[PDB]
Amino acid sequence: KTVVVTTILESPYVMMKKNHEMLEGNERYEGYCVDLAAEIAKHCGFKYKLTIVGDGKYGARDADTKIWNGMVGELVYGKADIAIAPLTITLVREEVIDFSKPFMSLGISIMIKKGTPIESAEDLSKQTEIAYGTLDSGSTKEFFRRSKIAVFDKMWTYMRSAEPSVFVRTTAEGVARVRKSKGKYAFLLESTMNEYIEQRKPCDTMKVGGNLDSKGYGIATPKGSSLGNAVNLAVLKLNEQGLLDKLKNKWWYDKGECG
Amino acid sequence: KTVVVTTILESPYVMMKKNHEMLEGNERYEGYCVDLAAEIAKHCGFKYKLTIVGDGKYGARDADTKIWNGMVGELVYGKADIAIAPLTITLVREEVIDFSKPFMSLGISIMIKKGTPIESAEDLSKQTEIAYGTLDSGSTKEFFRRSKIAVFDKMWTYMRSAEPSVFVRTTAEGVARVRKSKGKYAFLLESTMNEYIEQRKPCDTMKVGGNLDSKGYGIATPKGSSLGNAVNLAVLKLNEQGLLDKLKNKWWYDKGECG
Numbered sequence: 001k002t003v004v005v006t007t008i009l010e011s012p013y014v015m016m017k018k019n020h021e022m023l024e025g026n027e028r029y030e031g032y033c034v035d036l037a038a039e040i041a042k043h044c045g046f047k048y049k050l051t052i053v054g055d056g057k058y059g060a061r062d063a064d065t066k067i068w069n070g071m072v073g074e075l076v077y078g079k080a081d082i083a084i085a086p087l088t089i090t091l092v093r094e095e096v097i098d099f100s101k102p103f104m105s106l107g108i109s110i111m112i113k114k115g116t117p118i119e120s121a122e123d124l125s126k127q128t129e130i131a132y133g134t135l136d137s138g139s140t141k142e143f144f145r146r147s148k149i150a151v152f153d154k155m156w157t158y159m160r161s162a163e164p165s166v167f168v169r170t171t172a173e174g175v176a177r178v179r180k181s182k183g184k185y186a187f188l189l190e191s192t193m194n195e196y197i198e199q200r201k202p203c204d205t206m207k208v209g210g211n212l213d214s215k216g217y218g219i220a221t222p223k224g225s226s227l228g229n230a231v232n233l234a235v236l237k238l239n240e241q242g243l244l245d246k247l248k249n250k251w252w253y254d255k256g257e258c259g
Numbered sequence: 260k261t262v263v264v265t266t267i268l269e270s271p272y273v274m275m276k277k278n279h280e281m282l283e284g285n286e287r288y289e290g291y292c293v294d295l296a297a298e299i300a301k302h303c304g305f306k307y308k309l310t311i312v313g314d315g316k317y318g319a320r321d322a323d324t325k326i327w328n329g330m331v332g333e334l335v336y337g338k339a340d341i342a343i344a345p346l347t348i349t350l351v352r353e354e355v356i357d358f359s360k361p362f363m364s365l366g367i368s369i370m371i372k373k374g375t376p377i378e379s380a381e382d383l384s385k386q387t388e389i390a391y392g393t394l395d396s397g398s399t400k401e402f403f404r405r406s407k408i409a410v411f412d413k414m415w416t417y418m419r420s421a422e423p424s425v426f427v428r429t430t431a432e433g434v435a436r437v438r439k440s441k442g443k444y445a446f447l448l449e450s451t452m453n454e455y456i457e458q459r460k461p462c463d464t465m466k467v468g469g470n471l472d473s474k475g476y477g478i479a480t481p482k483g484s485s486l487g488n489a490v491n492l493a494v495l496k497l498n499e500q501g502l503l504d505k506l507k508n509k510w511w512y513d514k515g516e517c518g
C-alpha cells in the first residue's frame with residue numbers, strides 16, 4: 001500500500017510551496033526532506049504520502065502518562081510508517097523507534113546577532129547581560145536539562161531561572177528574538193538551522209564558536225518495520241552518491257543571500 | 260561467555276602500549292578504540308577479549324570468490340562477535356553486517372606537506388606535478404573507484420594510470436611519502452587520521468581544503484546478533500554524555516605537539 005510519511009514544517013526541510021494552493025499531494029511541499037523522501041521512495045520502490053504531524057512535535061515521552069508525542073508517537077502508535085524530518089537521533093528515541101544511519105550531521109550551536117561579544121558556550125555561561133535560551137521543546141532543551149557537563153549544567157540552571165523566559169516556541173521566534181534584541185539575546189539551536197539562517201537576508205546573524213555536541217538526523221520507522229532495512233541502505237547509497245551533499249548545497253548555499 | 264572483539268592496529272585507535280610485553284590481555288593495548296571497547300562493554304554488561312584481525316584488513320568482498328575479508332569477514336563467518344575499529348560505515352558492509360550509529364565523523368581529506376600549493380581535490384585533479392593517491396585497500400580507494408562524480412572519476416583515472424604507483428599500503432607509508440617527497444606527493448586519507456598526524460611532530464603536514472565526503476565509523480556486529488541493539492544504545496549514551504568527545508580530545512589534541 002502507500003507508505004504514510006509523517007513530517008513537519010520547518011525550513012528548509014519542509015515548506016509549503018508559494019503556489020501550493022494550485023498543487024496537490026506531495027507536490028504541495030518543497031525542501032530538503034521532501035527531496036530526500038522522494039529519493040528514498042524511488043530507491044526502495046514504494047509510493048508514499050507526506051502528512052504533517054498533528055501535534056507539531058518531534059518526539060518526547062510524557063513523564064506521567066508515558067505517552068510519546070510528535071512524529072515518534074505517530075510511529076510508535078501505528079499512525080505513520082516512516083518519519084522524514086530533521087529528527088535528531090537520540091538515545092531516548094532510539095529505544096522506541098528504528099533510525100537510519102544519519103542523513104545529515106549537526107550539533108547544538110550558538111546564533112548571535114552580528115557584533116555580539118560571544119565566541120563560545122563558556123562565554124555565555126559566565127554572564128547574564130546577554131540572555132540565551134533554546135526551543136521550549138526538542139532535543140536541544142533536553143540536552144541541557146540532562147547534561148552533567150559543568151558548563152552546560154550551569155547554562156541550564158541559568159536558563160530555568162532567567163527572566164523573562166529565555167525559551168522560544170519556534171525557530172522563527174528565536175531568530176526574530178536574536179535580530180530584535182540589540183545583541184542581548186543568543187539562541188541555542190541546531191547548527192543546520194543556524195547555518196541556513198546565516199545565509200539569509202538580512203544577513204545579521206551568525207553562527208559562533210564550535211558546536212556544543214555532535215549528532216545526526218535520521219529517518220525513523222516503527223520498531224521491527226520491514227521498511228527499516230531498505231531505507232537505511234537507501235540513505236547510505238544516497239550519501240555515497242553525493243546526493244545528500246547536493247541537497248544540502250541546494251537548500252542552504254546555492255542561493256545564499258549573504259555573500 | 261566472553262565477547263570476542265576483533266580490531267586492528269592503527270594509531271591512535273589501537274596501539275600496543277610501549278610496555279606491552281609486561282602486560283596481559285586487553286591491557287596490552289591503548290587508544291581511542293580500546294577505551295571505547297571498555298566503555299561499551301561496561302554499559303552493555305559483558306566481558307570481552309580484544310583480538311587483532313588476522314589478515315590485517317577492514318572488510319571487502321572478493322569479486323570472484325565472494326568471500327569477505329578483514330574484520331567484516333570475521334563477523335560474517337562467525338570468528339568474532341563485535342568489531343571495534345575505525346571501520347567506515349559503507350553500504351556494501353551494511354548489507355552483510357549490523358552497524359551501530361556512528362561513534363565518530365570523518366571524510367576523505369587531503370594531506371599535504373606544508374608549503375604544497377594545493378587547496379582542494381579539484382586542484383589535484385587538474386595537475387600531475389604533485390602525485391596523489393590513497394591506501395591500496397579500504398573505503399577511500401573504493402570511493403574513488405566507484406565514484407560517478409566527475410572530479411573524483413578523473414582523479415581515479417589519474418591514480419590508476421600514474422607511475423610510479425601512487426598507492427600506499429599503510430597510513431605510515433603514506434605519511435612518510437608525503438614528508439619525503441618535497442611537496443610532490445599528496446595523500447588522500449580519512450580526515451580523522453589526517454587530523455591526528457597534523458598534531459604530531461615534525462609538524463610538517465597539514466589537512467587541506469574541505470573533506471571530499473561525509474561519513475562515520477561504526478561498531479559492527481554479525482547480522483541478527485543480540486548484542487547489536489545494546490551496543491548501539493551504548494554508543495548513543497556515550498555520545499550524549501560527552502565521552503566520545505572526551506576520547507577524541509584525549510587521543511588527538513590534549514597532547515598535541517604542534518601548537
Ligand SMILES: C=C(C)[C@H]1CN[C@H](C(=O)O)[C@H]1CC(=O)O
Pocket residue numbers: 010058059086087088135137138139140141171188189190
Ligand atoms: C526544530 C525542532 C524543534 C527540532 C529539530 N531537531 C530537534 C529534535 O529532533 O528534537 C529539534 C530542534 C532542537 O531541539 O533545537
Ligand SMILES: C=C(C)[C@H]1CN[C@H](C(=O)O)[C@H]1CC(=O)O
Pocket residue numbers: 269317318345346347394396397398399400430447448449
Ligand atoms: C586505515 C584503514 C585502511 C581504514 C580505516 N577506515 C577505512 C575503512 O574502513 O575502509 C580504511 C581507510 C581508508 O580507506 O582511507
